[PDB]
Amino acid sequence: GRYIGPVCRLCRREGVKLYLKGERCYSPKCAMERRPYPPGQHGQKRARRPSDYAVRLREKQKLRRIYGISERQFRNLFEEASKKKGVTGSVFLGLLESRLDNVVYRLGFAVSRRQARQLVRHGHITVNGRRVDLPSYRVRPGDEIAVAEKSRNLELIRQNLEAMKGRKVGPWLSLDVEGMKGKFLRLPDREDLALPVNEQLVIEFYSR
Amino acid sequence: PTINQLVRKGREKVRKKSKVPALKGAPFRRGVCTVVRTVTPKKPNSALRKVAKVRLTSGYEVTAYIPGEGHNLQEHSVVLIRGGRVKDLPGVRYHIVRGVYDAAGVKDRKKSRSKYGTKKPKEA
Amino acid sequence: GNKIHPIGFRLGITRDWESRWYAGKKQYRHLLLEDQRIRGLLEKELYSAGLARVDIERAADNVAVTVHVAKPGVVIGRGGERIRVLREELAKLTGKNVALNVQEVQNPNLSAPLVAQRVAEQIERRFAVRRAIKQAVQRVMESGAKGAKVIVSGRIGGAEQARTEWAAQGRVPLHTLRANIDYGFALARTTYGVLGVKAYIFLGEV
Amino acid sequence: DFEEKMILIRRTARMQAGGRRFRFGALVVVGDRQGRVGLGFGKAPEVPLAVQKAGYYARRNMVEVPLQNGTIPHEIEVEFGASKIVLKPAAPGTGVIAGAVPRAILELAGVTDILTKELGSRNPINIAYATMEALRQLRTKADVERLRKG
Amino acid sequence: IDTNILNRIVDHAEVTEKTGVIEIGPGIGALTEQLAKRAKKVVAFEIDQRLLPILKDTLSPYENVTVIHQDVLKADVKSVIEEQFQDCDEIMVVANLPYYVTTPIIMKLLEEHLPLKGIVVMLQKEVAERMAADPSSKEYGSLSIAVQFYTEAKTVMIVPKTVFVPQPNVDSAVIRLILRDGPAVDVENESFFFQLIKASFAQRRKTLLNNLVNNLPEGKAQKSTIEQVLEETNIDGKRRGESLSIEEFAALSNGLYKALF
RNA sequence: AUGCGCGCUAGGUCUCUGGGUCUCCUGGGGGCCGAAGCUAACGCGUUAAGCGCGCCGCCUGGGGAGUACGGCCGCAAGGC
RNA sequence: UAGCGCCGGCCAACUCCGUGCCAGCAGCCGCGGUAAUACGGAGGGCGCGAGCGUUACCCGGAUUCACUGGGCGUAAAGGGCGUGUAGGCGGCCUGGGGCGUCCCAUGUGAAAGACCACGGCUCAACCGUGGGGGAGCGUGGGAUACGCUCAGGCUAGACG
Ligand SMILES: [Zn+2]
């Protein structure tokens, strides 16, 4: 079970915009443009300097909340990345970006990661001409992601991909806006992602 | 020491000493209460702690600490004994699991119900 | 302990009498009583403006009251209305055609009475005593004033037992006659009793 | 220009004729994250004064560190008094594996990947000094070659 | 306290012995103290009881600073300007504002038609960008249209987070808003003007027609009229919505309502 | 309160006892300052508590306790 | 269908009421006698989430049995002192043997488990197909620097 409840409160607590809600967090309503302090009774009091543990925890929580995945899955992914070759940080980010729901959000089918998760789970998304209904599915370079024929006329997808005309997609992706389909080309770099996260702190946190 | 000294004698391992002999390698035990007495704490603390005397399924007969606000532990109540030591009371080395056999969960908890075993208050 | 008054120690030299006039034995006490009454009234009335010094002199059945104030506008008032009514009050008190004068003390951070009353006002407003004293001494020290010293009596922050704070900086030679030390006292009345504030300032030598 | 870090404020006391006189000691690390680190220990009867003094001392006593790929050229093992520090080079994407004090010192050095261990007494001041010595005792391939070959 | 930077803000306001200054939410009085030494008259609105003694004490050496214990929203600003500023030419507002009351506090002042010359304030950098936005910069919206319809805006610089001793979460920026000589564009239907402005940016990535027809029951009924009037005013609901200038909205607010007003 | 043996690491100074070519040079022993270095500190420092190698005996928080029990040795008290 | 623990420092999360060394909390340091962020209740927050806590046990942190990796002047620790058995260790130069030692080839080191790659369950768990690796021990061949050994010498240790 993922996290269900208030969202922009996470925006507030983490102190970064963290586009979770889709469109609202682009309008003057993201709750960062009004009351950008953490929630609660003592949200706007001069706080003591954060501890090392606090810093690492906050960094990890921010990175986790971006993709909206369980702590268990997060730790499993980190372990996998650690065991692999190359830089832990780069590999970890590459593994977080290879998720089906995240890829769906990237390609522009959905406005938010949560909407993308719902679309995936509800069977509106196909991978290599086969229905996949699992948000945690890992896609690989050279895969074909498309919208199911049945769902090609749904209002949500129609207007989402109508807004993607004359708009750029990530360098590690291609999209056929008219073709109701995309393509995953390669693992994204550290430079490619505009994450407000210093993954070194995540590594250090998990070291303890 | 020299390598020869170590070959001839070697290093003696260290063995841990159990702090809960009465349990006999079991998470809990079942006992029968005999005496329900209130006692006094070591120096810096001054109160009147409620303490039972429990004869276990083992041969052991030990004092136990009853945690909570009020209890219904009579002279013949069947109880479950748990590990854990009270820093103050000189001799007790076990607690009582609230709400198991005859011990009942302390009336009207709202914050820590896992401990002090009490059912969730059906809200209205 | 038991330091004597730093002004009284220097009445002859480096300081001057606040009241300057003459009267025979027959008519001394009356003039002094009138003088004390004038001082009382002025302290009572002009406190808001930041009074620091009251000078009285007599020539021939006349009074020339000079008031040294940080803020002279408050005393003067709008179109010289307040000064006029104050003059009227003083003249009504004693029929001696009093001649009130108003002077503005230059750099009001260099007058010890002003510093003392400011610290007392701060204490009345439930401030932190030590920090206030440190800041006051710092402000005195900034604008020349070769020496500065501030003492707050006791019963700090609504405590049970009294204690002295004393922050000072520079040279304060209370033992030298040619010192030109300016001294100021204040009394801070709070809900847990009274407090005494003393300020010493040292402005060069000779 | 230089970043500052804080290790410990400690309030020490000495007896007098009927009472105690206090004094605060401050430990401060000053660094530019490019290979320059200074450590200062400052005593004063008042905390900001102690911080200022420690900062001053840190700015004086500076040490250059031979960084390459944000790691240490060679593993080292330095004992100061009864404290012992062990440093080891690490591959990229490892992070600073260190306690509060060594991490504080090494972060301002620009080191991004290292493994550390504290041994013996763990008095923070001694550990800080030991870390300083270990940093001060580093050599490169070039330096050793110059020493030997010339 | 943010040192000489305070003296910088006043420098960006250019106040002298000629000017009277309105202070909104002074706090301790860091900015107020700096303003006092450079301005003929200073007025302040403070509503917090706990910070009042400190503010009063900070203002002890000064005389030309007045503090009124009343919320800005409830109090009539016009009267306060009438008395407090009887003998000054330029009337200016310099302030730093709490996060919640940033825009509405500006809007109240702008709506009231005060004789204010300029409002030089410190706000969020994001809000600063939104207030002073060029067309189709994703910063263009209701805020920009409203402010620039009332007052010309100019962002001076960006104040970094690494200034305040407690480091905040979001950066700050200083803006100037000079009151325009009369309304920017002639339209009698101010209310519906604002209605159109706010409705047109209902969905940023949607088109003008979507943002127009969906709003308003009459509008949701009389679809064709909107289109024919838009074509009458040489505008179309296809471009985007965010690419229009203020005068275009003036023409539309004339025509569309002229059809039904 | 410092196990035994050997090798290396500035000196100065006071002594006891031999040899020489005899202001001095060279061995063995007993003290006092002190290079390098070691030590938590006190201090040690060519008679090491320095730098190394070999072999042996010991320590693993403080009371209970050098106690109880068992064993060995003593006439005994006692000892291990 | 959304619960459970926590919010004094370790250790991320703060205020108001009730009690006044009482009721209690407690892993350690300790909090409780009228201003309790440490007890009890609320509001709020933090962590995990179909789970969350507690007890028991094992490894780690413990370099706190120290081979890697400790010590014995005063912190626990040099036998009261000799002589000496077994045992441990041992100068310089040549030559043989090749026991320790090192290298190569090879048999074994089963299957599952561990690592890498590719695949089937719509993914994952799970499973399958290949590739290695692996301390040790056998068998054959090779090298002689060091240790052991045998033979011949030398005087710097030892002895006369
Ligand atoms: Zn948001």
From Swiss-Prot, chain A:
Residues engaged in binding Zn(2+): 8, 11, 25, 30
Residue intervals of the S4 RNA-binding domain: 98-160
UniProt-listed InterPro entries: Ribosomal_uS4, Ribosomal_uS4_bac-type, Ribosomal_uS4_CS, Ribosomal_uS4_N, S4_RNA-bd, S4_RNA-bd_sf
Disulfide bonds: none
Pfam assignment, any one: Ribosomal_S4
Co-factor binding details: Binds 1 zinc ion per subunit. In a number of structures (e.g. 4Y4O, 5FDV) a 4Fe-4S cluster is seen in place of the zinc cofactor.
Claim: rRNA processing is one of the keywords in the record: no
Record SUPFAM superfamilies: Alpha-L RNA-binding motif
Entry's Gene Ontology BP terms: ribosomal small subunit biogenesis; translation
Gene Ontology molecular functions: metal ion binding; rRNA binding; structural constituent of ribosome
Keywords from the named record: Metal-binding, Ribonucleoprotein, Ribosomal protein, RNA-binding, rRNA-binding, Zinc
Physiological role: One of the primary rRNA binding proteins, it binds directly to 16S rRNA where it helps nucleate assembly of the body and platform of the 30S subunit. Binds mRNA in the 70S ribosome, positioning it for translation.
The protein's assembly and partners: Part of the 30S ribosomal subunit. Contacts protein S5. The interaction surface between S4 and S5 is involved in control of translational fidelity.
Name assigned to this protein: Small ribosomal subunit protein uS4
Swiss-Prot record, chain C:
Domain KH type-2: 38-106
SUPFAM superfamilies in the record: Prokaryotic type KH domain (KH-domain type II) (SSF54814), Ribosomal protein S3 C-terminal domain (SSF54821)
PROSITE patterns referenced in this protein's UniProt entry, alphabetically: KH_TYPE_2, RIBOSOMAL_S3
Highest taxon of the lineage: Bacteria
Keywords, ordered alphabetically: Ribonucleoprotein, Ribosomal protein, RNA-binding, rRNA-binding
Stated role: Binds the lower part of the 30S subunit head. Binds mRNA in the 70S ribosome, positioning it for translation.
Protein's UniProt name: Small ribosomal subunit protein uS3
UniProt source species: Thermus thermophilus (strain ATCC 27634 / DSM 579 / HB8)
Curated annotation (Swiss-Prot), chain D:
GO biological process annotation, one example: translation
Molecular function via GO: rRNA binding; structural constituent of ribosome
Tagged with keyword RNA-binding: yes
Keywords (A to Z) from UniProt: Ribonucleoprotein, Ribosomal protein, RNA-binding, rRNA-binding
Assigned GO CC terms: small ribosomal subunit
Disulphide-bonded residues: none
Chain ranges of the S5 DRBM domain: 2-65
Gene3D superfamilies for the chain: 3.30.160.20, 3.30.230.10
Pfam families (UniProt xref): Ribosomal_S5, Ribosomal_S5_C
Family: Belongs to the universal ribosomal protein uS5 family.
Functional summary from the UniProt entry: With S4 and S12 plays an important role in translational accuracy.
Domain notes: The N-terminal domain interacts with the head of the 30S subunit; the C-terminal domain interacts with the body and contacts protein S4. The interaction surface between S4 and S5 is involved in control of translational fidelity.
Classification via NCBIfam families: rpsE_bact
Subunit organization: Part of the 30S ribosomal subunit. Contacts proteins S4 and S8.
Note: Is positioned such that it could physically interact with spectinomycin.
Protein name as annotated: Small ribosomal subunit protein uS5
Swiss-Prot record, chain E:
Pfam families given in the database record: RrnaAD
Residues the entry annotates as binding S-adenosyl-L-methionine: 25, 46, 71, 96
UniProt catalytic activity: adenosine(1518)/adenosine(1519) in 16S rRNA + 4 S-adenosyl-L-methionine = N(6)-dimethyladenosine(1518)/N(6)-dimethyladenosine(1519) in 16S rRNA + 4 S-adenosyl-L-homocysteine + 4 H(+)
InterPro entries: KsgA/Erm, rRNA_Ade_diMease-like_C, rRNA_Ade_Mease_Trfase_CS, rRNA_Ade_methylase_Trfase_N, rRNA_adenine_dimethylase, SAM-dependent_MTases_sf
Localization annotation: Cytoplasm
SMART domains, alphabetized: rADc
Any one GO MF annotation of this record: 16S rRNA (adenine(1518)-N(6)/adenine(1519)-N(6))-dimethyltransferase activity
GO cellular component terms listed in the entry, alphabetical order: cytosol
GO biological process annotation, one example: rRNA methylation
Effect of loss of the gene: No visible phenotype. Not essential.
Domain of life the protein comes from: Bacteria
EC number: 2.1.1.182
Keywords attached to this entry: Cytoplasm, Methyltransferase, RNA-binding, rRNA processing, S-adenosyl-L-methionine, Transferase
Function: Specifically dimethylates two adjacent adenosines (A1518 and A1519) in the loop of a conserved hairpin near the 3'-end of 16S rRNA in the 30S particle. May play a critical role in biogenesis of 30S subunits.
UniProt similarity note: Belongs to the class I-like SAM-binding methyltransferase superfamily. rRNA adenine N(6)-methyltransferase family. RsmA subfamily.
Name of the protein this chain belongs to: Ribosomal RNA small subunit methyltransferase A
Gene designation: rsmA
